[PDB]
Design a protein around this nucleic acid. Sequence first.
DNA 1: TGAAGTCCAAAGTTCAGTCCC
DNA 2: AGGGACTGAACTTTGGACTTC
Lengths: 76, 78
Amino acid sequence: ALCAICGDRATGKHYGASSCDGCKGFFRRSVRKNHMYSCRFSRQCVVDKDKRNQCRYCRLKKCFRAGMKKEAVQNE
Amino acid sequence: ALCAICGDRATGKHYGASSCDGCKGFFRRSVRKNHMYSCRFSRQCVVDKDKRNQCRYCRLKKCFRAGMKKEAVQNERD
DNA sequence: TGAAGTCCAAAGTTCAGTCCC
DNA sequence: AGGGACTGAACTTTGGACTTC
Ligand SMILES: [Zn+2]
Ligand SMILES: [Zn+2]
Ligand SMILES: [Zn+2]
Ligand SMILES: [Zn+2]
């Protein structure tokens, strides 16, 4: 099973979508800090294993596209 | 532990070797900008906390000899 | 046990001081 | 004078290892 966000190896369902440990942590931290970030390009950046850290905005957007929900992220 | 490159205090393992923040930073920049340093002397310069900035060629050479890996340096990001 | 959570080593970024073109 | 480059410390983000409900 591959990560629905970046294509890396998936470790199971996280926050509503199958994803790797990276996209898992990235999403949780983003939601808890209520970050939306911003893209400096056309908000259509390539989010794969190698470039996932190049644009937080696009990575986060794809997490939501993949099915992740803020609702699934807990406080603390 | 100490920096395997210059002897200064090590802040942990960096790019594969125990090193300080100075050598950590130096290696990263050297790799990302693919700088081709040269040595004015015999390429046997002593690299310590004191002289580390005297010869970039030898400090980089020491970095690789100490275990730092080019592959461990990631691409710059925002 | 599934899917939340936490921990933390090792990546990354910014920038003041300082000097060269 | 404006443009550019380097160093290393302060501080943040990443993601794999492990823990709780
Ligand atoms: Zn992923
Ligand atoms: Zn983008
Ligand atoms: Zn050092
Ligand atoms: Zn030298």
